[PDB]
């Protein structure tokens, strides 16, 4: 288009922003946005071509590192490795003062 | 409470970002934690700018153009939980700036242009958990500075220039779970390279330059998610995974496969998703005997002309099957695969469908027979699939297309029949 300035390399009101200025990620669903560090519960992913940032398959996760690894669990639950459980499995005992699972 | 530019919010958290500033904010909220300083023009960081802020948990320095950081600029504030430095001009690991943070659980160094990684790096950071180095200039796995991180369960080395991983390179990371090596120059891997990670469930070798199958994974007992793709591997050997019975995911696609080991996919039992594509020279459908549970299977681009008569005896778990783009000249009972939903047979040599071929598939939805040699469809059973919705018969030898049990098809592709052509 013409004179679309803001934050992204090629922006058209026809279906939102595309091809973000490096190095930033795109968002989706109205329709498409460009920013750093995709919000919860997305995880930031990077490729050479596409900076597409995705949603984790890990249940109730605020911040993901990957498909199946979660860095910050949701307020209710305990984090053991990459996966989030309501009850710290034993397995290993729970910690306290913060929700984490320590072995 | 609220310094002017910054958007003071919630309880602890503060947001100064976007936009936008140089140096730090005027107002020091001394009881504040979780500062977002990202998305600004900040040239350098002066020492003590973070001394004025104690109790701090998470700090976002991302989005800045930052050439250099003062070694004491972080003041050694002991409460910092996570630090995001990504998308900055840092030409090296600020190992001196990072000393004295014992509370750091997560580091983002990615999107920097970083070449040199000092041997004293990541010292004291033993509470560290998840580490980002990607879209850097790295030409070598930073071994020694990586060995100060006993508690690290997430590491990413991807989008770099790393061409070779020496043996014992990961030796001292005992807690590691996920390792991303993807998008490198990687050609050779030391036989012992993955020695030391007994906790790794996830290995990503995709988009590399590999020649031979990475037997280095023989040292991975807990391995579950595995890929190496868009490599040059020509061969999958016998007992390739024998040390890895916990694999539930394997993406080997886009590899110039030639021979595949009979004993290679046998007895897996945990395997769920298996993706093979672009193996042009493989003539025989792999022996999966022992592997009875698969949700999703893909064989594409092969010369395989046939399918095991017994294949669907043991496959009762299977939702999604893609055999597209092979040499398959005939068919076989798909009953027993009843869990089936998406079936892709397009671009094969199949000339026939039979009453009992699809007999008893309650779950079948997408069915792809396009681009085949099909002429007749024996005793016309699609009747048994109530779920069938998308059906593609396009481009076959058909003069007539049997209709029964086609209720509720949303899409039907009839084109190119019969063709003839010829």
CB nearest A82 (choices: B38, B87, B177): B177
Q: What method did the depositors use to determine the structure?
A: X-ray
Count of residues in chain B: 422
How many helices (H) and strands (E) chain A has is answered by: 0, 10
Q: Closest Cα partner for B18 from A6, A15, A11?
A: A6
As a whole number of angstroms, the distance between CA B158 and CA B217 comes to 18
- What is the pairing mode between strands A70-73 and A61-64? antiparallel
Q: A45 in contact with B at a CB cutoff of 8 Å?
A: no
Question: How many domains is chain A partitioned into structurally?
Answer: 1
Q: How far is B217 from chain A (nearest CA, A)?
A: 19
- Residue B15, phi then psi, degrees to nearest 5: -130, 110
Count of residues in chain A: 103
Q: How far is A2 from chain B (nearest CA, A)?
A: 23
As a whole number of angstroms, the distance between CA A72 and CA A79 comes to 8
Q: Could you tell me if residue B421 is left (phi over 0), alpha (psi between -120 and 50 degrees) or otherwise beta?
A: left
The answer to whether the CB atoms of B129 and A71 lie below 8 A apart is yes
As a whole number of angstroms, the distance between CA B264 and CA B283 comes to 15
The answer to whether the CB atoms of B135 and A67 lie below 8 A apart is no
The answer to whether the CB atoms of A65 and B154 lie below 8 A apart is yes
How many CB atoms are located within 10 Å of the residue B373 CB? 13
Give chain B as a 3 state SS string: CCCCCCEECCCCCEECCCCCCCCCCCCCCCCCCCEECCCCCCCEECCCCCCCCCCCCEEECCCCCCCEECCCCCCCCCCCCEEECCCCCCCECCCCCCCCCCCCCEEECCCCCCCECCCCCCCCCCCCCEEECCCCCCCCCCHHHHCCCCCCCEEECCCCCCCEECCCCCCCCCCCCEEECCCCCCCEECCCCCCCCCCCCEEECCCCCCCCCCHHHHHCCCCCEEECCCCCCCEECCCCCCCCCCCCEEECCCCCCCEECCCCCCCCCCCCEEEECCCCCCCCCCCCCCCCCCCEEEECCCCCCCCCCCCCCCCCCCCEEECCCCCCCCCCCCCCCCCCCEEECCCCCCCEECCCCCCCCCCCCEEECCCCCCCEEHHHCCCCCCCCCEEECCCCCCCCCCCCCCCCCCEEECCCCCCCCC
How many CB atoms are located within 10 Å of the residue B9 CB? 12
Q: Closest Cα partner for B281 from B238, B234, B239, B321?
A: B234
Q: Closest Cα partner for B237 from B254, B210, B258?
A: B258
How many CB atoms are located within 10 Å of the residue B410 CB? 9
Q: Reply yes or no: is the peptide bond before residue A91 cis, omega within 30 of 0.
A: yes
H-run or E-run covering A35? strand A33-35
Contacts of residue B2, defined as CB under 8 A and 6 or more positions apart, other chains included, come to: B8, B27, B29
Instruction: Give how far Cα B75 sits from Cα of A92, A95, B51, Å.
Output: 35, 29, 5
Contacts of residue B208, defined as CB under 8 A and 6 or more positions apart, other chains included, come to: B181, B182, B183, B184, B185, B186, B187, B228, B230, B231
3-state secondary structure of A41: coil
3-state secondary structure of A5: coil
As a whole number of angstroms, the distance between CA A36 and CA B14 comes to 17
How many CB atoms are located within 10 Å of the residue B357 CB? 19
Site from B201, B249, B272 to mutate, A interface, most A CB atoms within 10 angstroms: B201
- What is the pairing mode between strands B7-8 and B14-15? antiparallel
Are B182 and B207 in contact by the 8 Å Cβ rule? The answer is: yes
Q: Tokens 């290995």 — which residue?
A: B203
Q: Closest Cα partner for B238 from B264, B269, B219, B212?
A: B264
Q: Reply yes or no: is the peptide bond before residue B240 cis, omega within 30 of 0.
A: no
Resolution (A): 3.2
The most distant pair of C-alpha atoms in chain A lies apart, rounded to whole Å, by: 60
Q: Tokens 């997430």 — which residue?
A: B154
Q: How far is B158 from chain A (nearest CA, A)?
A: 9
Are B227 and B250 in contact by the 8 Å Cβ rule? The answer is: yes
Q: Closest Cα partner for B213 from B173, B181, B261, B177?
A: B261
As a whole number of angstroms, the distance between CA B244 and CA A2 comes to 55
Q: CATH code at A24?
A: 2.10.220.10
A83-94: b (≥16 Cβ within 10 Å) or e: bbbeebeeeeeb
Q: How far is B289 from chain A (nearest CA, A)?
A: 28
Structure tokens, B82: 């996570």
Are A60 and A73 in contact by the 8 Å Cβ rule? The answer is: yes
As a whole number of angstroms, the distance between CA B200 and CA B151 comes to 13
Are B43 and B65 in contact by the 8 Å Cβ rule? The answer is: yes
Q: List, in order of start, the domains of chain B with CATH numbers.
A: 1-422 (3.80.10.10)
As a whole number of angstroms, the distance between CA B268 and CA B224 comes to 11
As a whole number of angstroms, the distance between CA B82 and CA B165 comes to 28
3-state secondary structure of A42: strand
As a whole number of angstroms, the distance between CA B15 and CA B28 comes to 13
As a whole number of angstroms, the distance between CA B272 and CA B263 comes to 18
Structure tokens, B299: 């064989």
DSSP A75: T
- Residue B164, phi then psi, degrees to nearest 5: -155, 135
Are B46 and B67 in contact by the 8 Å Cβ rule? The answer is: no
* Torsion sign across C-alpha atoms B213, B193, B116, B58: positive
Q: B114 in contact with A at a CB cutoff of 8 Å?
A: no
Q: Closest Cα partner for B191 from B149, B259, B243, B144?
A: B243
As a whole number of angstroms, the distance between CA B161 and CA B135 comes to 9
As a whole number of angstroms, the distance between CA B187 and CA B28 comes to 51
Instruction: Give how far Cα A54 sits from Cα of A25, A68, B287, B396, Å.
Output: 10, 12, 35, 39
The answer to whether the CB atoms of A46 and B159 lie below 8 A apart is yes
Residue A89: give the domain boundaries.
1-103
Q: Long-range contacts: B394-402, Cβ < 8 Å, 24+? A: B394/B370, B395/B370, B395/B371, B395/B419, B396/B369, B396/B370, B396/B371, B396/B372, B397/B351, B397/B373, B398/B374, B399/B375, B400/B376, B401/B377, B402/B377
Question: If 0-12 CB within 10 Å is exposed, 13-18 middle and 19+ buried, where does residue A3 land?
Answer: exposed
Q: Closest Cα partner for B107 from B155, B67, B148?
A: B155
The answer to whether the CB atoms of A81 and B62 lie below 8 A apart is no
């Amino acid at each position: 288009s013409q004179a679309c300035a803001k934050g992204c390399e090629l922006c058209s009101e026809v279906n939102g922003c595309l091809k973000c200025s490096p190095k930033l990620f795109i968002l989706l669903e109205q329709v498409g946005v460009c920013l750093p560090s995709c919000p919860p519960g997305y995880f930031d992913a990077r490729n050479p071509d596409m900076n597409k940032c995705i949603k984790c398959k890990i249940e109730h996760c605020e911040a993901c590192f990957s498909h199946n690894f979660c860095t910050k669990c949701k307020e209710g639950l305990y984090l053991h490795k990459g996966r989030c459980y309501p009850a710290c499995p034993e397995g290993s005992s729970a910690a306290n003062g913060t929700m984490e699972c320590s072995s | 409470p609220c310094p002017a530019p910054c958007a003071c919010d919630l309880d602890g958290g503060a947001d100064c970002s976007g936009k936008g500033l140089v140096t730090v904010p005027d107002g020091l909220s001394v009881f504040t934690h979780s500062l977002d300083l990202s998305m600004n023009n900040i040239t350098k960081l002066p020492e003590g700018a973070f001394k004025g802020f104690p109790y701090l948990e998470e700090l976002r320095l991302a989005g800045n153009d930052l050439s250099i950081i003062h070694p004491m600029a972080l003041s050694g504030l002991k409460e910092l939980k996570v630090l995001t430095l990504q998308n900055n001009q840092l030409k090296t690991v600020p190992s001196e700036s990072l000393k004295g943070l014992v509370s750091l659980q997560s580091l983002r160094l990615d999107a920097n242009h970083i070449v040199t990684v000092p041997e004293d790096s990541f010292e004291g950071l033993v509470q560290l958990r998840h580490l980002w180095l990607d879209d850097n200039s790295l030409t070598e796995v930073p071994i020694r500075p990586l060995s100060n991180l006993p508690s690290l369960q997430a590491l990413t080395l991807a989008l770099n220039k790393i061409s070779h991983i020496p043996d014992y390179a990961f030796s001292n990371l005992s807690s590691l779970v996920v390792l991303h090596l993807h998008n490198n120059k990687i050609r050779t891997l030391g036989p012992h390279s993955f020695h030391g990670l007994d906790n790794l469930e996830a290995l990503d070798l995709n988009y590399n330059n590999l020649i031979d199958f990475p037997d280095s994974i023989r040292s991975l007992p807990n391995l579950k998610e595995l890929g190496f793709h868009s490599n040059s591997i020509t061969i999958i050997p016998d007992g390739a995974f024998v040390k890895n019975p916990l694999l539930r995911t394997i993406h080997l696609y886009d590899n110039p496969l030639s021979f595949v080991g009979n004993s290679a996919f046998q007895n897996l039992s945990d395997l769920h998703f298996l993706i093979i594509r672009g193996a042009s020279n493989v003539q025989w459908f792999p022996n999966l005997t022992g592997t009875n549970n698969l949700e999703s299977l893909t064989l594409t681009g092969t010369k395989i002309r046939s399918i095991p008569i017994k294949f669907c005896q043991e496959q009762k778990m299977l939702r999604t099957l893609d055999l597209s783009y092979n040499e398959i000249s005939a068919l076989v009972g798909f009953e027993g695969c009843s869990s089936l939903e998406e079936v892709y047979l397009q671009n094969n040599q199949i000339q026939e469908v039979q009453n009992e071929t699809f007999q008893g598939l309650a779950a079948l939805r997408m069915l792809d027979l396009s681009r085949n040699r099909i002429h007749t469809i024996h005793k016309e059973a699609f009747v048994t699939l109530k779920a069938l919705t998308n059906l593609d018969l396009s481009f076959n030898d058909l003069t007539a297309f049997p209709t029964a049990g086609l209720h509720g098809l949303n899409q039907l592709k009839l084109t190119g029949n019969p063709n003839f052509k010829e």
